[PDB]
Design a protein around this motif. Structure first.
Motif, short mmCIF file in Angstrom:
data_model
loop_
_atom_site.label_atom_id
_atom_site.label_comp_id
_atom_site.label_asym_id
_atom_site.label_seq_id
_atom_site.Cartn_x
_atom_site.Cartn_y
_atom_site.Cartn_z
N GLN A 1 0.67 -1.23 0.07
CA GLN A 1 0.03 -0.10 0.06
C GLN A 1 0.88 1.11 0.08
O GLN A 1 0.71 2.23 -0.79
CB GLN A 1 -0.91 -0.08 1.11
CG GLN A 1 -2.03 1.03 1.17
CD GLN A 1 -2.63 1.36 2.40
OE1 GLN A 1 -2.43 2.59 2.80
NE2 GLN A 1 -3.16 0.42 3.03
N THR B 1 1.66 -8.22 3.17
CA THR B 1 1.69 -8.48 1.56
C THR B 1 2.83 -8.05 0.93
O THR B 1 3.49 -8.42 0.00
CB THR B 1 0.39 -8.02 1.09
OG1 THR B 1 0.46 -8.32 -0.18
CG2 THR B 1 0.19 -6.69 1.25
N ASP C 1 -6.78 -9.79 1.63
CA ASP C 1 -5.41 -9.35 2.02
C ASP C 1 -4.55 -10.42 2.81
O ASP C 1 -5.27 -10.92 3.65
CB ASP C 1 -5.74 -7.82 2.79
CG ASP C 1 -4.51 -7.19 3.17
OD1 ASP C 1 -4.24 -5.90 3.30
OD2 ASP C 1 -3.69 -7.75 3.99
#
Ligand SMILES: Nc1nc2c(ncn2[C@@H]2O[C@H](COP(=O)(O)OP(=O)(O)OP(=O)(O)O)[C@@H](O)[C@H]2O)c(=O)[nH]1
Ligand SMILES: Nc1nc2c(ncn2[C@@H]2O[C@H](COP(=O)(O)OP(=O)(O)OP(=O)(O)O)[C@@H](O)[C@H]2O)c(=O)[nH]1
Ligand SMILES: Nc1nc2c(ncn2[C@@H]2O[C@H](COP(=O)(O)OP(=O)(O)O)[C@@H](O)[C@H]2O)c(=O)[nH]1
Ligand SMILES: [Mg+2]
Ligand SMILES: [Mg+2]
Lengths: 432, 51, 206, 430, 202, 439
Positions: A11, A138, A91
Motif C-alpha cells: 500500500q 503482503t 489481503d
C-alpha cells in the motif's frame, strides 16, 4: 534506448508511486491523459504507442483492492495500462507467511508475466526499482518472492529497493518486527542496493524545515518522489558528470554483504523563506551532512563512514564542489574509515529540480542529494533484534505464522543471519 | 431576578409593555420569541394597557 | 505628533528647514528653559519628544484629555508608536497580492478543464476495463456530467483581472513564522496539512 | 504560551471568579456569548493565557468550579457571562460541610476530590506548557479551608516545579459571621504554609474601610468588593498578557519577593481609587500614584504596615509610562522612610512596567509588599484559637470524625513557631 | 568658508547614472560604469562593475572628489549631468547612456532648471520649428513621411533620430529621449506616430 | 570582505539591538522590507553594507545578528512589528520559560537546551563570512537569563573559536537606583564568568545616561528607547571605521592591542560628544576642541564613575566628520597640558586617535540633531574600581545571612560558588590598586 522498470508492491509503495508518477509526468510535460500538448528524453520511463499516448514503465501489485480501485478512479485513469494494475482479493492481513507461501504464490505468476511483456519490448534495460513498505505482510512477502524469482531469472541485472523500515519507537502495527526480520533475511542475499527510508526522520524534517506541524502521507511521498527524481535525473538529462544506475554497486558497497545505505536531501524549505538566502552550494552541502537531516533515524556521529555519493542538480560549479569537499574533509566532527582515504563520488546535472504547483516545496535553482554508506546503521539492526527477541522468548503470535506453512525453525536462521551481519559490521568497523 | 438593560430601546430598563408575545425580544444578548402568555396576563393587559 | 507632522514635504523641499531643522518659523516653541504652565506637561505627561516638541504639541492643540478613552487610540503600543517607518523626508511592499493571484489562477485553470457536457473523448464514458467495484445493472451505464456553468467560470474571471490593479485590497497582513498567538482557530478546525504560510491566510480569512 | 488555569472552590471563590472573569472578558472584548468583538489585534495576541477554543469560533473558560454544595454554582451559572463556563467543569457535592474543617478535609472532600483532581489533571495535560496554578478561597468556611488545602497538597505532590499562588480571605475578628473561624483558619494555614508557593491575604474590613474612606460610597456591596479584588489580582498577571518595557511573570515576582521559603504571605493594593464626585479634580501622575499607593489605608489588609519594617516590596505600574520618574520616585520614597525598611536588604524594591492600562484609565499600580506587619493577624487568630481550645468547647464536633487534639496541638505549635521565626527577621541587624 | 546650508538642504539628493567610456584604448570600450553625483558640494564618484566570468578586477574607479571642466574652468553642476552627454573628468571621457528612474523623477519634478526634460517645452520647441515651411499641414505631412519612410506606425530610436537629422533641425538627444519615452504606450521604446500626430494637431 | 557578528541576549539586549539596527538600516539606506528603495534600481557599488548585512542574490539583505531570549513576548512583538520581513525567521531564538532573574536557571537548568540551537545558528552564520573580524555581545547584566546565557555562550565560544575577538557591552546596575533586588548576586557571578573570557568589557550604567539626557537633551521625562538610541549611535560610531573611508582607519583588532595593558584589566568606560538638540544645537560653534573638552568633562561620562578618583590607563578616541589633524593635535596638546586630568607615570603617551569622514546620521523622531563634527572616546582607567567595591559591599550585606541563597541552591549550583567569585573580585581589586601605584 536506456530504460528502467519500476515495481510497486504494498500500500505504501502504491501511494508513493502515485506521488513519483505525477512528478515524472509534470516534469516531462506529460498531460494526465498521456497525450502531447503539441510541442526521446522521456524514453527512459515511457514507451511510445505509435501515435500520441505513452505507457509508463511501471507495474503495481497488491492483494487488497481498495487502493488500486482508488488509483483507477482517480485522475490518471487513462495513463496506465489497465492490465498492469494487478489486484487480488484477500489481503495478507499483515501475515508474512500468508504473503510469502499461501496467496502471493499464485499472483507472482502474472507479475512475472507482465515483467516479461514489459521487458521484451525494452532494448538496453538498465535495471529495476522496487518499492515496498516493510511493516506490511503482503508488501514484505510479495517483495521477497519477487526478489527471489528475479534473481534466479535475471541474475546480474541491477535491482534497487527503497525500503521504509519502522521507526525505532513509533509504529503502526504490533507484529511488524517479525516480518521486518524475515524480509531483511530474504532480501539480504537477493537485492543489490537497499535504501533506508524510515518515517520518524522524515516526520522530524517536515516539522523542522517545511514548518508543517500536522503533515500527512502525501508530503512524505512527495519528498520521496523528489529523491527518486534526483537519483534518476542524470539518466535522462545532460550533465557535466553524469552517472548510470550501474555506477553504484561499484562505488557505495565495500563488500557483498554490506549494501544497506541511507539517504538525505537538501535544500528542503518553504515558500516563506527560500528567497531570503543565497542557497549557496557550500551551505546546502553542509546542510546535507548535517546529522539531523538524515532520511533515516540513525546518528552518523556514532559510527565511521565508508562511502558517500552525492548528486547535484542546477547551476553548480566544479570549483564550488571541490572547495566544499575540501571543507568537509577538513572538518573534524566527521571521520572516515581507515582503509578509505577518499570516499566521495560526485555527479552533476544541468536541469534544475521541478516544483509541483500547490505543493509545499518552493522553486530553487540548486539541489543536492546524498547517498551514504556508514557503520552507524548497525543500531537499527540491534534494536529490532532486541524487539524480535522480546517477542520470540515467549513465542507470542507464533501460531499465526505456523498455521499457514511456516516452519518453526525459520526464525532462528534469520536471527543467526542478522547476528552474522552485525558481527561483520563490527569486523569491518575496526582499523588495521 | 434582576433588572436588565434593553438594547432595543436606548439602553433602557425593561418595561412590561416591552414584553410582547408574537414579537421577538433581546435579553442580554439572547433572542427570545414569546409564543403564549397566561390569561392572567391577558386580563392585566385588558384592564391596564387599554389607553 | 509634531515629529511626523511638522517638517512637511513642502517645507523640507526647496524650503527654509531641513530634516532636524531650526523649526521655529513653522510654529512656536519655548526655547528650552522656561518657568510657566504650558497647559499639557503636568497633566498628559508626554514622553521623549524634546521640550520644544512638548510645548509645540500643547500650543498647536493636537492633544487629548479626560479620564475616559475610547478603543482606538487607547490600544497602541510604544514599539509601533516610536518605530513607525521612515515618514516625512522624501515623498510598503506590493506582495501578498502576487501569490493570492497565483492562487485564484490555479483554481481557475483547474475548474476550467472538467470537460463539461459530453466533451470527454469516446473513452472514459465507462470506467476502466478492469475496475472491480459493483457495476449495478439497473442503472444508466454511461456517466452523466453536470460540470460548472459558464457563469461561474466568468465568476472567477473578472475577479482575477480586478485583483490586477483593482479596487479590492490585498487582504489581511500576517506574521511570518514564530508568532505564538492564537492566530484564530487552527486548532478548532484542523486544517492539518496546509503550509503554515497558507494556514495563516486561510485561518484569518475564515 | 506560558498559560495558566483557574481553580475555584467554595462560595467565596466562586463569587470572586464570577466577577474576575467578567473583568477579563471586558478587558479582552469578549461578549457574554463567547464571540470576539474587540478592536485591536492585541486583544487576541495573548488570548490563550486564560481562554481555550471551541468549535464554531467561540471561546471557553479554563476554569474549574468545584464545591460541596451546588446552590452557589446553580446561582452563578445564571449570571452575566455565566454561560461561558463548561457545564462539565462544574463539580458538586450533595451533603455540605456546615463550615466544618474536619468534614470538608477528611470525610466528604477526600471522596469527592477524585473527579475534580481528574478534571484538573485533564486541563493541565491539555495546555502546551503550564505556568502554574492560582486558587481563590476564604479561610472562614470549613469546606473551602479544608478541601481546597487538601487539593493544594495533592497538586503540589504531582507538580513540584510549577508555581502555586493562593488568594486567602482570612476571617477578621471584627466581621466574624461564624464562630468556628479560629479552628478552621488555623487548620488551613498550617497546611497552607507548608505547600503553597505564595499567598496573598485579603481582609473584608480592609475592603470596607477602603470603600468608605477613599471611594466614599453609602452602601457598599459584595459586588463592589469582588470588583476591587478582581481588578487588583488581574493587575499582577496583566503584564503576562500584554507587552511592556520590563516583562515580569509570577515566577520572577516569586524569585524577587521572598528571601526565605517559609515567608510567602503578602499584603496587596491597587491604585488609583477615587470617588465619583472626586474623580475629576485630580490628574494622574507618578508621584500621585505612588503617594496614594504607599498609604497605609489603601492596603487590602487591616494590618498596619508602619508598625513594622518592610522586608521587600514590588510595584507593577501599568499604562504608557517611562522609567526615570518611576524609579526616581521609588528611590525617593525608599530614602524618605528609611526607618520602615530593614537595613540589611538595600534596594528592596522591584519595579515593573506593563504597557496596557485598565479600561477607562491612563495609569494604574498593583502593589505587593512583604512586611513583618502581617504578624499581628496571626497573633489575634492564635489568641482567639487558644481561647477556643483551652475549654475544649466546640471540639467534640471535630473529634467525632477520626482526628484528635494532637493535630490541633501540632498546628498551634507550627503557627507559633512561624510567628516567632517571622518576627525574628524584624529585629535582625547587620 | 563652506556652504553649510547647502549641505543641510540637499544632502539626500543623489543622482545615479549609467554610462560608457570613450577614451584612448580599444580594449576598454566595452565595460560599463556607474556615475554618482552628490549635490551637497557638487562631487562626482565613478564605479566600475564587473559582470560575472569576465576577468576584469572591477572596483572603485574614481573616488568622491570634486573637479571642474577644463575649458570653461567652472565646476560641473546638475545642469551638465544630462543623459546622452559627454563629460570629461580629468582625462577620462564618459557618455551618459542611462539614468535611474529616481533620477528621471527628479529631472521631471524640478523644472525651470531642466528645461529639456519638460514635455510641453519640447513640444513647443518642435512646433515652433515649423515656421520655415510654407503651410502647417504640409509641414506635418512632410514630417510624418520623413520619420516613417514606409508608414508602419512604429519605429525605433535610431530611425527617429536619423530621420530628424535628415530634416536637419537641432533637437538634442535629451528631448529625443523625452518624446520617445513619453510616447511609448507599453514601455518598450516603440513610438506611436499616431499619438504624436494627434498631439501636434488633428 | 570584512564582517562582524552581533549577538543580543535578554530583553534589554533586544531593545538595544533594535535601536542599533534601525540606525544601521537608515545609515546604509535599507528600507524596512529589505530592498534599497524599490525606486532606485542600479546600486551595485561601494559595498560597505557587507560589514553588517549579506546579499540574497537579488533584492533584500539579511542582518548578520542573532537574538536570544527565553520569554517570547519581545520575540513575538518584533516578529509582528515593522521589521518583520527583514530578519530571517529562525534567527530570533525564543524559549518557553523565563529564567526569572535567576542566574542558576539560565546557566544550569534551561539554557542548555537552547545553547545547542544558538551555536548551530552561530555556525550557520559564521561559515558564510570569509574575513569575519570578531563578535559583539549585548546583555543586561542585572537579569538572570541574559547573564546566564551570556556567560555560558562566552564559555562555549572561547573554546569553539579560541583567539577571535569578542567585545561585551554590559549594562551594570546603577550604584543606588535598581529595578530588581537580587541583581548583586547574578552580577557578581556573571562578572566572575566573563572576567577570564571576554577580551573587552565596556560599562553601560543607566544612571549616567539618564543624567546626560536630563542635562543635555533637555528631556525631563525620558524612556529606555532614548538611551537605546544613544547606545546605538555609539555602536555606529565604533563600527563606522570598518565600513567608511577615513584618513586614519582603526579596526576592532586595534583595540586589544592598544587599550588593555594586562589580560586581567579589560573593563573600560566611554563617553560621547556632542549631545545637543537642534532647538539649541546650531547656536554654537561645535568646534573640535570644545567637543573634546566636553567629552573629557567628568559629568559627561557615560558610566557613573568619577575619573578624578583614579588615574588614566589608556584612551582610544575617534572623530567623525570634517576634522583635521592640526585641530586634533591642538586639542590633544591642551588636554595633556591641563592639570586636572593626570596620567600614570609609566604612560607618557596614552592616546590613540581615529579619523572618519562620514558625519553622523540623524534618525527621524529622535532627539539628537545633525552636526558636521562628532567625537567618541573610550577610556580604560583605575577609577572604575569604585563600582566593584560598592557592589562587593552590597553582595556581602546580602550573603552575611544567606538570604535568597536557596533559590540558587535548588537549581543545581554548588553552595561555595559564591565564595570563588568573591575571591576573584577581591583579587581584581588588589590587582587594580597594585597597578595604580607609582614606580
Ligand atoms: N513512509 C510511509 N510508510 C507507509 C505508508 N503507508 C504505509 N506505510 C507503512 O506500512 C506499514 C503497513 O504496511 P502498509 O503499506 O500500510 O500495507 P501493506 O504493505 O500493503 O501490507 P498489508 O497491510 O498487510 O496489506 C505501516 O506500519 C506504515 O508504517 C506511506 O505512505 N509512507
Ligand atoms: N538601559 C536599558 N537597560 C535595560 C533595558 N532593559 C532591561 N534593562 C536592564 O536589565 C535589568 C533587568 O534585566 P532584563 O534585561 O530586564 O531581563 P534579562 O536580563 O533578560 O533577565 P530576566 O529578567 O530574568 O528576563 C534592569 O535592571 C535594567 O537595568 C533597556 O531597554 N535599556
Ligand atoms: N469577598 C467576598 N467575601 C465574602 C462574600 N461572601 C462571604 N464572604 C466571606 O466568606 C466567609 C464565609 O465563607 P463561607 O460561606 O463559609 O465559605 P464556604 O464554607 O466555602 O461556603 C465570610 O467570612 C465572608 O467574609 C463575598 O461576596 N465577597
Ligand atoms: Mg496493506
Ligand atoms: Mg527577560
Amino acid at each position: 534506448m536506456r530504460e528502467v522498470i519500476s515495481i510497486h508492491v504494498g500500500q505504501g509503495g502504491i501511494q508513493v508511486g502515485n506521488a513519483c508518477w505525477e512528478l515524472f509526468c509534470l516534469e516531462h510535460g506529460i498531460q494526465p491523459d498521456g497525450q502531447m500538448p503539441s510541442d526521446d528524453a522521456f524514453n527512459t520511463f515511457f514507451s511510445e504507442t505509435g501515435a500520441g499516448k505513452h505507457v509508463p514503465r511501471a507495474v503495481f501489485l497488491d492483494l487488497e483492492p481498495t487502493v488500486i480501485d482508488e488509483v483507477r478512479t482517480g485522475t490518471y485513469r487513462q495513463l496506465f495500462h489497465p492490465e498492469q494494475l494487478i489486484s487480488g482479493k484477500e489481503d495478507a492481513a499483515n501475515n508474512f507467511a500468508r504473503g510469502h507461501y499461501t496467496i502471493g504464490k499464485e499472483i507472482v505468476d502474472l507479475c512475472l508475466d507482465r515483467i516479461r511483456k514489459l521487458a521484451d519490448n525494452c532494448t538496453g534495460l538498465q535495471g529495476f526499482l522496487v518499492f515496498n513498505s516493510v511493516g506490511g505482510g503482503t508488501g514484505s512477502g510479495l517483495g521477497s518472492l519477487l526478489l527471489e524469482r528475479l534473481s534466479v531469472d535475471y541474475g546480474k541485472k541491477s535491482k534497487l529497493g527503497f525500503t521504509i523500515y519502522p521507526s525505532p519507537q513509533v509504529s503502526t502495527a504490533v507484529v511488524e518486527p517479525y516480518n521486518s526480520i524475515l524480509s531483511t533475511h530474504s532480501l539480504l542475499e537477493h537485492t543489490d542496493v537497499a535504501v533506508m527510508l524510515d518515517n520518524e526522520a522524515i516526520y522530524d524534517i517536515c516539522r523542522r524545515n517545511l514548518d508543517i506541524e500536522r503533515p500527512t502521507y502525501t508530503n512524505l511521498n512527495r519528498l520521496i518522489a523528489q529523491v527518486i527524481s534526483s537519483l534518476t535525473a542524470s539518466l535522462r538529462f545532460d550533465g557535466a558528470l553524469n552517472v548510470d544506475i550501474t555506477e553504484f554497486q561499484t562505488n557505495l558497497v565495500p563488500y557483498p554483504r554490506i549494501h544497506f545505505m541511507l539517504s538525505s536531501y537538501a535544500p528542503i524549505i518553504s515558500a516563506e523563506k527560500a528567497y531570503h538566502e543565497q542557497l549557496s552550494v557550500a551551505e546546502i552541502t553542509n546542510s546535507a551532512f548535517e546529522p539531523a537531516n538524515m532520511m533515516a533515524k540513525c546518528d552518523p556521529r556514532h559510527g565511521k563512514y565508508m562511502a558517500c555519493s552525492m548528486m547535484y542538480r542546477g547551476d553548480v560549479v566544479p570549483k564550488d564542489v571541490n572547495a566544499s569537499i575540501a571543507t568537509i574533509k577538513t572538518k573534524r566532527t566527521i571521520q572516515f574509515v581507515d582503509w578509505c582515504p577518499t570516499g566521495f563520488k560526485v555527479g552533476i546535472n544541468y536541469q534544475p529540480p521541478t516544483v509541483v504547483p500547490g505543493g509545499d516545496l518552493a522553486k530553487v535553482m540548486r539541489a543536492v542529494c546524498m547517498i551514504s554508506n556508514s557503520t552507524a546503521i548497525a543500531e537499527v539492526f540491534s534494536r529490532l533484534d532486541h524487539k524480535f527477541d522480546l517477542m520470540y522468548a515467549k513465542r507470542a503470535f507464533v501460531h499465526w505464522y505456523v498455521g499457514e506453512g511456516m516452519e518453526e525453525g525459520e526464525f532462528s536462521e534469520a536471527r543467526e543471519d542478522l547476528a552474522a551481519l552485525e558481527k561483520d559490521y563490527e569486523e569491518v568497523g575496526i582499523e588495521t | 431576578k434582576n433588572r436588565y438593560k434593553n438594547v432595543q430601546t436606548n439602553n433602557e430598563y425593561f418595561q412590561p409593555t416591552d414584553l410582547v408575545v408574537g414579537k421577538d425580544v433581546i435579553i442580554n444578548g439572547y433572542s427570545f420569541r414569546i409564543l403564549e402568555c397566561d390569561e392572567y396576563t391577558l386580563k392585566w393587559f385588558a384592564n391596564n394597557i387599554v389607553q | 505628533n509634531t515629529t511626523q507632522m511638522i517638517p512637511t514635504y513642502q517645507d523640507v523641499k526647496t524650503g527654509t528647514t531641513w530634516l532636524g531643522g531650526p523649526t521655529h518659523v513653522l510654529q512656536e516653541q519655548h526655547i528650552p528653559g522656561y518657568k510657566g504652565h504650558v497647559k499639557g506637561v503636568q497633566a498628559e505627561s508626554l514622553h521623549g519628544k524634546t521640550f520644544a516638541r512638548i510645548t509645540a504639541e500643547c500650543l498647536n492643540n493636537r492633544y487629548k484629555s479626560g479620564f475616559i478613552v475610547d478603543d482606538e487610540e487607547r490600544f497602541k503600543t510604544n514599539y509601533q508608536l516610536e518605530y513607525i517607518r521612515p515618514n516625512l523626508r522624501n515623498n510598503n511592499n506590493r506582495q501578498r497580492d502576487d501569490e493570492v493571484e497565483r492562487l485564484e489562477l490555479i483554481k481557475a485553470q483547474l475548474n476550467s478543464q472538467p470537460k463539461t457536457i459530453e466533451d470527454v473523448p469516446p473513452i472514459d464514458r465507462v470506467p476502466v476495463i478492469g475496475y472491480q467495484g459493483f457495476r449495478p445493472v439497473y442503472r444508466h451505464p454511461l456517466k452523466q456530467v453536470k460540470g460548472p456553468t459558464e457563469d461561474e467560470i466568468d465568476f472567477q474571471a473578472r475577479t482575477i483581472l480586478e485583483l490586477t490593479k483593482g479596487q479590492k485590497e490585498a487582504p489581511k497582513e500576517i506574521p511570518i513564522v514564530g508568532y505564538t498567538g492564537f492566530q484564530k482557530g487552527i486548532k478548532a478546525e484542523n486544517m492539518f496539512g496546509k503550509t503554515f504560510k497558507d494556514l495563516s491566510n486561510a485561518s484569518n480569512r475564515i | 504560551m506560558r498559560e495558566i488555569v483557574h481553580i475555584q472552590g467554595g462560595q467565596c471563590g466562586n463569587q470572586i471568579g464570577a466577577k474576575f472573569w467578567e473583568v477579563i472578558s471586558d478587558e479582552h472584548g469578549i461578549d457574554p456569548t463567547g464571540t470576539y468583538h474587540g478592536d485591536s489585534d492585541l486583544q487576541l495576541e495573548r488570548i490563550n493565557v486564560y481562554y481555550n477554543e471551541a468549535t464554531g469560533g467561540r471561546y471557553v473558560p479554563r476554569a474549574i468550579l468545584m464545591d460541596l454544595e451546588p446552590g452557589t454554582m446553580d446561582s452563578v451559572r445564571a449570571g452575566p457571562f455565566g454561560q461561558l463556563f463548561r457545564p462539565d467543569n462544574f463539580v458538586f457535592g450533595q451533603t455540605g460541610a456546615g463550615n466544618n474543617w474536619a468534614k470538608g478535609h477528611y470525610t466528604e472532600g477526600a471522596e469527592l476530590i477524585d473527579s475534580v483532581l481528574d478534571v484538573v489533571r485533564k486541563e493541565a495535560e491539555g495546555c502546551d506548557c503550564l505556568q502554574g496554578f492560582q486558587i481563590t478561597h476564604s479561610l472562614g468556611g470549613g469546606t473551602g479551608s479544608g478541601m481546597g488545602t487538601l487539593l493544594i497538597s495533592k497538586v503540589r505532590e504531582e507538580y513540584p516545579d510549577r508555581i502555586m499562588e493562593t488568594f486567602s480571605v482570612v476571617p477578621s475578628p471584627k466581621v466574624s459571621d461564624t464562630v468556628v473561624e479560629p479552628y478552621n483558619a488555623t487548620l488551613s494555614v498550617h497546611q497552607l504554609v507548608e505547600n503553597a508557593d505564595e499567598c496573598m491575604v485579603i481582609d473584608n474590613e480592609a475592603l470596607y474601610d477602603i470603600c468608605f474612606r477613599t471611594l466614599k460610597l453609602t452602601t457598599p456591596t459584595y459586588g463592589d468588593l469582588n470588583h476591587l479584588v478582581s481588578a487588583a489580582m488581574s493587575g499582577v498577571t496583566c503584564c503576562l498578557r500584554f507587552p511592556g518595557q520590563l516583562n515580569s511573570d509570577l515566577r520572577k515576582l516569586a524569585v524577587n519577593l521572598i528571601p526565605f521559603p517559609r515567608l510567602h504571605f503578602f499584603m496587596i493594593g491597587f491604585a488609583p481609587l477615587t470617588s465619583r464626585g472626586s474623580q475629576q479634580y485630580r490628574a494622574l501622575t507618578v508621584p500621585e500614584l505612588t503617594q496614594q499607593m504607599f498609604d497605609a489605608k489603601n492596603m487590602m489588609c487591616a494590618a498596619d504596615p508602619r508598625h513594622g519594617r518592610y522586608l521587600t516590596a514590588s510595584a507593577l505600574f501599568r499604562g504608557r509610562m517611562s522609567t526615570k520618574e518611576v524609579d526616581e520616585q521609588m528611590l525617593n520614597v525608599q530614602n524618605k522612610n528609611s526607618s520602615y525598611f530593614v537595613e540589611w536588604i538595600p534596594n528592596n524594591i522591584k519595579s515593573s512596567i506593563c504597557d496596557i492600562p485598565p479600561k477607562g484609565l491612563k495609569m494604574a499600580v498593583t502593589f505587593v509588599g512583604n512586611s513583618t506587619a502581617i504578624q499581628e493577624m496571626f497573633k489575634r487568630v492564635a489568641e482567639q484559637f487558644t481561647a477556643m481550645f483551652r475549654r475544649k468547647a466546640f471540639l467534640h464536633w471535630y473529634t467525632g470524625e477520626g482526628m484528635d487534639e494532637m493535630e490541633f496541638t501540632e498546628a498551634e505549635s507550627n503557627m507559633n513557631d512561624l510567628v516567632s521565626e517571622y518576627q525574628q527577621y524584624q529585629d535582625a541587624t547587620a | 568658508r563652506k556652504d553649510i546650508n547647502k549641505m543641510y538642504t540637499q544632502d539626500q539628493y543623489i543622482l545615479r547614472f549609467e554610462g560608457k567610456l570613450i577614451s584612448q584604448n580599444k580594449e576598454d570600450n566595452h565595460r560599463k560604469f556607474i556615475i554618482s553625483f552628490f549635490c551637497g558640494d557638487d562631487t562626482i564618484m565613478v564605479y566600475e562593475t564587473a559582470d560575472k566570468n569576465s576577468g576584469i578586477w572591477g572596483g572603485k574607479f574614481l573616488e568622491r572628489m570634486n573637479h571642474n571642466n577644463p575649458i570653461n574652468n567652472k565646476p560641473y553642476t546638475e545642469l551638465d549631468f544630462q543623459i546622452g552627454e559627454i563629460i570629461q573628468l580629468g582625462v577620462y571621457r564618459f557618455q551618459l547612456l542611462r539614468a535611474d528612474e529616481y533620477t528621471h523623477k527628479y529631472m521631471k519634478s524640478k523644472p525651470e532648471v531642466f528645461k529639456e526634460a519638460d514635455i510641453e517645452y519640447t513640444l513647443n520647441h518642435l512646433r515652433k520649428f515649423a515656421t520655415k515651411y510654407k503651410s502647417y499641414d504640409e509641414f506635418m505631412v512632410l514630417l510624418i513621411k520623413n520619420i516613417d519612410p514606409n508608414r508602419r506606425g512604429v519605429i525605433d530610436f535610431n530611425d527617429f533620430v536619423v530621420g530628424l537629422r535628415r530634416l536637419g533641425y537641432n533637437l538634442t538627444y535629451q528631448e529625443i529621449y523625452t518624446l520617445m519615452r513619453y510616447f511609448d504606450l507599453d514601455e518598450n521604446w516603440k513610438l506611436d506616430v499616431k499619438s504624436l500626430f494627434v498631439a501636434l494637431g488633428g
